[PDB]
Amino acid sequence: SMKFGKSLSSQIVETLPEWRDKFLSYKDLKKRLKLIGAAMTPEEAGFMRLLEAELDKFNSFFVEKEEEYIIRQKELQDRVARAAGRESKEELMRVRKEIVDFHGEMVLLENYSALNYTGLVKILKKYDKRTGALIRLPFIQKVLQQPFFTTDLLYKLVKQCEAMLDQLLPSNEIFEMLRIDEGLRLKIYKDTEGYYTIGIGHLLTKSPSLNAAKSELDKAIGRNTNGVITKDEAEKLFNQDVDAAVRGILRNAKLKPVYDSLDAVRRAALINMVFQMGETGVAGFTNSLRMLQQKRWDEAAVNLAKSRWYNQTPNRAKRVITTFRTGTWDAY
Amino acid sequence: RMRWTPELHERFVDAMNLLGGSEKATPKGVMKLMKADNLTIYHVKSHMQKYRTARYRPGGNFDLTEALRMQLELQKRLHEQLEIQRSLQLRIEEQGKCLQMMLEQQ
Ligand SMILES: O=P(O)(O)O[C@H]1[C@H](OP(=O)(O)O)[C@@H](OP(=O)(O)O)[C@H](OP(=O)(O)O)[C@H](OP(=O)(O)O)[C@H]1OP(=O)(O)O
Ligand SMILES: O=P(O)(O)O[C@H]1[C@H](OP(=O)(O)O)[C@H](OP(=O)(O)O)[C@H](OP(=O)(O)O)[C@@H](OP(=O)(O)O)[C@H]1OP(=O)(O)O
């Protein structure tokens, strides 16, 4: 099933009154088809007039909305640029809400165009079936070239909006990296060894007692957990582990000079390594670390690939090596 | 109507700022400074009113932020599918054209 009529209505109802009678007059057009039994009958020309009027209303509304969005985009970009990360908790919440809402409205205009197009095809199909004509193909070829269907520069505006949000409403890049590499578990489990662990490789205790691992969890979180935690409890626990790992690196003579020289991204790749094999294991890559410190990305990649680590966890190792190569999250 | 571009709007802001801002600039002056192809006084008047409108001067927040993250996630997923849908609609018409060229020739 497609349930077009029902979905078009459900969307129209979810719009502001300015969007009133801006969508396809699907119910109406289906009723006017019943009246259809230049070589074109007055009935057929009158119905074709309704379809052209529909297209005019779509194109006129779309380009007017694009114009609003161009003005809104520039205004939001300036508000964000003027503040330069110095927004209060109140102000930051306001501008984030406004940009997420703006993004939503542009996706709404994109959905408006998709729904109007889908119904247009449904009307032309019913029309051709009723008239014995073959005009759906040339009529839709005309539609596929109209502003509203193509989406115009709306794709560029959503992209710009999403770029403002990658800075303003950021994701914990290292958390998402290691929830892919190590894995995120909300219930007390046992690692490769016989010790109790939770979240993303957070060892609670080496004790065989399950209540000894439970009491350590209630201390770390600060509440009565029973062995289960939420995503943000596991995220805050991991953030503490990262800070601890960085504190360790910054006091390691074999790791600090290279960590200091790396960018934020390549620093997360090194923390990843430390989480997996430990500070001592990582400090053992003397030659590869030298290549990373000297910003010889490719040379460090070829060298890290011949390590036992690369054969141990190849999926994870390749993703970390690519992060050292590119200096981007494009592996994750 | 006028297909505005971000580049064209940027030029309009400069023109109007150079004319003392939205509360001092006239559509006639903006028109003259811009010297843009097919731009009319009507377009500038309509654009300035939208500009003046968009520049109008007058639990927990962590849960609101988490709700925005999902709102954004869901909008991004719909956007991705709409891009996919556009390609689907184009293929349908391309096959439909072939099916018509094939049946006329039988
Ligand atoms: O859909 P319904 O619940 O059956 O309501 C219908 C219908 O209105 P809509 O389809 O626009 O919602 C029309 O009947 P159809 O054209 O769909 O057959 C309409 O106008 P008609 O005189 O052309 O039948 C008719 O009558 P009215 O608007 O005078 O109340 C009305 O009510 P009925 O249920 O009694 O048909
Ligand atoms: O009975 P409904 O739940 O209200 O759905 C019906 C109908 O379903 P059935 O043929 O199974 O009874 C068709 O649904 P789909 O094709 O989307 O699966 C469709 O009728 P047509 O496609 O043959 O036109 C549609 O109409 P619409 O095109 O508006 O989506 C709609 O009928 P109503 O919208 O008039 O209620």
Give the residue, by CA position, lying nearest to ligand 2 atom 33.
A5
A157 contacts on B by Cβ (under 8 Å)? 6
Report the candidate in A149, A116, A157 with the shortest Cα–Cα distance to residue A15. Answer: A116
Resolution number, Å: 2.6
Which strands sit side by side in the sheet containing A202-205, from one edge to the other?
A185-190, A196-199, A202-205
From CA A317, how far away is CA A269, in angstroms rounded?
10
Compute chain A's Rg from CA coordinates. 29
User: Is A182 labeled as catalytic in the residue annotation?
Assistant: yes
The two structure tokens encoding residue A231: 């995503």
CB distance A71–B51 less than 8 Å? yes
From CA B83, how far away is CA B79, in angstroms rounded?
6
Whether A164 contacts A99, CB under 8 Å: yes
Question: B80 CA to middle of ligand 2, Å?
Answer: 27
- Residue by residue, DSSP assigns A35-100 as T------HHHHHHHHHHHHHHHHHHHHHHHHHHHHHHHHHHHHHHHHHHTT---HHHHHHHHHHHH
Whether A275 contacts A182, CB under 8 Å: yes
- Residue by residue, DSSP assigns A137-199 as HHHHHHHTTSHHHH-TTHHHHHHHHHHHHHHHS---HHHHHHIIIII-EEEEEE-SSS-EEEE
Q: Give the CA distances from residue A217 to residues A79, A201, A230, A234, A295, in Å, rounded to whole numbers and listed in that order.
A: 43, 13, 12, 11, 41
Which experimental method was this entry solved with?
Answer: X-ray
Report the candidate in A284, A273, A263, A245 with the shortest Cα–Cα distance to residue A177. Answer: A273
List all residues 6 or more positions away from A91 whose beta carbon is below 8 Å from its beta carbon.
Answer: A83
From CA A46, how far away is CA A68, in angstroms rounded?
33
From CA B62, how far away is CA B68, in angstroms rounded?
10
Distance between first and last Cα of chain A: 36
The two structure tokens encoding residue A182: 């190590």
Whether B23 contacts A84, CB under 8 Å: no
User: Is A56 labeled as catalytic in the residue annotation?
Assistant: no
List all residues 6 or more positions away from A44 whose beta carbon is below 8 Å from its beta carbon.
Answer: A36, A131, A133
Helix (H, G, I), strand (E, B) or coil at A239: helix
Q: Give the CA distances from residue B16 to residues A249, B23, B32, B49, B58, in Å, rounded to whole numbers and listed in that order.
A: 54, 9, 11, 13, 21
List all residues 6 or more positions away from B94 whose beta carbon is below 8 Å from its beta carbon.
Answer: none
Q: Give the CA distances from residue A302 to residues A257, A287, A308, B45, B81, in Å, rounded to whole numbers and listed in that order.
A: 21, 11, 13, 62, 38
Whether A76 contacts A95, CB under 8 Å: yes
Q: How many alpha carbons fall within 13 Å on the CB side of residue B69?
A: 10
The answer for A 122-151 residues in CB contact with B (under 8 A) is 134, 136-137, 140-141, 144, 147, 149, 151
The two structure tokens encoding residue A327: 């200096």
From CA B83, how far away is CA A225, in angstroms rounded?
43
Q: Give the CA distances from residue A50 to residues A8, A154, B88, in Å, rounded to whole numbers and listed in that order.
A: 19, 27, 26
From CA A324, how far away is CA A106, in angstroms rounded?
36
- Residue by residue, DSSP assigns A293-314 as HTT-HHHHHHHHTTSHHHHHSH
Which residue type does A29 have?
L
Whether A259 contacts A250, CB under 8 Å: yes
Whether A177 contacts A272, CB under 8 Å: yes
Which residue type does A107 have?
V
Question: A4 CA to middle of ligand 2, Å?
Answer: 7
Which residue type does A45 have?
A
Q: Using CA atoms in the order A116, A117, A123, A124, what is the torsion angle rounded to 10 degrees?
A: 150
How long, in residues, is chain B? Answer: 106
From CA A91, how far away is CA A84, in angstroms rounded?
12
The two structure tokens encoding residue B90: 């184009």
Helix (H, G, I), strand (E, B) or coil at A205: strand
> What is the DSSP pairing of strand A196-199 with strand A185-190?
antiparallel
The two structure tokens encoding residue A80: 């964000």
How is domain B6-55 classified at the architecture level of CATH?
A: Orthogonal Bundle (1.10)
Report the candidate in A267, A264, A276 with the shortest Cα–Cα distance to residue A308. Answer: A276
> What is the DSSP pairing of strand A202-205 with strand A196-199?
antiparallel
From CA B46, how far away is CA B1, in angstroms rounded?
10
A89 contacts on B by Cβ (under 8 Å)? 61
Give burial (CB, 10 Å; 0-12/13-18/19+) of A64. middle
**Tokens 């520039």 map to which residue?**
A74
